[PDB]
């Protein structure tokens, strides 16, 4: 769905983030909801990575490997490089422990 030109968190346009400063929105490819990266708390390089991809918001995000949410969707990991979501049991290899700190998905890792 086409982007909603308003940030879901601060209701500002791309012309006024929470600091009343211009900042382009990220927009969910599935539901069209948008957010300023500053409002989403994304770091700059995550932001520039997400801009080049088909991004889903937190609520729309399905696991990139198995393509479902499922009953334990709240514990799906988000890639610190690309914001893709992965269930623990769908990681490479499947994880039985929640990673502490930075985690990067299989899509972003080198071949």
């Amino acid at each position: 769905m086409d982007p909603i030109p308003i940030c879901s968190f601060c209701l500002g346009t791309k012309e006024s983030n929470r600091e009343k400063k211009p900042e382009e929105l990220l927009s969910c490819a599935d539901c069209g909801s948008s957010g300023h990266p500053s409002c989403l708390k994304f770091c700059p390089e995550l932001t520039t990575n997400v801009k080049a991809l088909r991004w889903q918001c937190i609520e729309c995000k399905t696991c990139s490997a198995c393509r479902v949410q499922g009953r334990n969707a709240d514990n799906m990991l988000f890639c610190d490089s690309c914001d893709r979501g992965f269930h623990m049991e769908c990681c490479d290899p499947p994880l039985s422990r929640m990673p502490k700190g930075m985690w990067i998905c299989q899509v972003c890792r080198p071949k």
């Binding site: 995000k61 514990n75 799906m76 988000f78 979501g85 929640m98």
Partner: peptide
């Protein structure tokens, strides 16, 4: 790692 839960709280709520 960031999860759907940590991200949702990290941002705070959507505007009502």
């Amino acid at each position: 790692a960031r999860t759907k839960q940590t991200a949702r709280k990290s941002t705070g709520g959507k505007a009502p």
